Amino acid sequence: LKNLINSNYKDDPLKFSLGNNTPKPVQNWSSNWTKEEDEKLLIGVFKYGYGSWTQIRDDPFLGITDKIFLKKVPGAIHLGRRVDYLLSFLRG
């Protein structure tokens, strides 16, 4: 992930998009989600690493700060699984 994001984007990773890779949607989360929310999450994880979920959610350039919770559906485990899928798909 860091190699590909540097390789194209490094001039500014805020340029990043997942592009032609079309991910499967989130399953009925309490928040609407798209390739855009995925892309912003990926840029977050690039800036702050995996599992930095407080910083990932808090960074306002990602626009996440509303969409992700501390029994509302998506949480750290769901975020982890989503990242696992997204990176597996992009590496595929």
Next chain:
DNA sequence: GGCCGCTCTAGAACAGGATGTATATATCTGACACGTGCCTGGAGACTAGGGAGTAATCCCCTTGGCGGTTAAAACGCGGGGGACAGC
């Protein structure tokens, strides 16, 4: 076209980290006792001279007695002032 397997989500359990408190253990602190080494004083030895002790005699002082006189002490009595208790 149908059913089962696989994947994801949800719940439950366990462990670790974080924080505060209590308890046990270690360390310090001090004084005494013993050992060691060195130096000084005491102990031992010997001599000479002075002081103390001993003896005798004489003189002065102290103790005891007598007598008289005078002053002091003791006994007595009354009144006043001070001391004591109270408030």
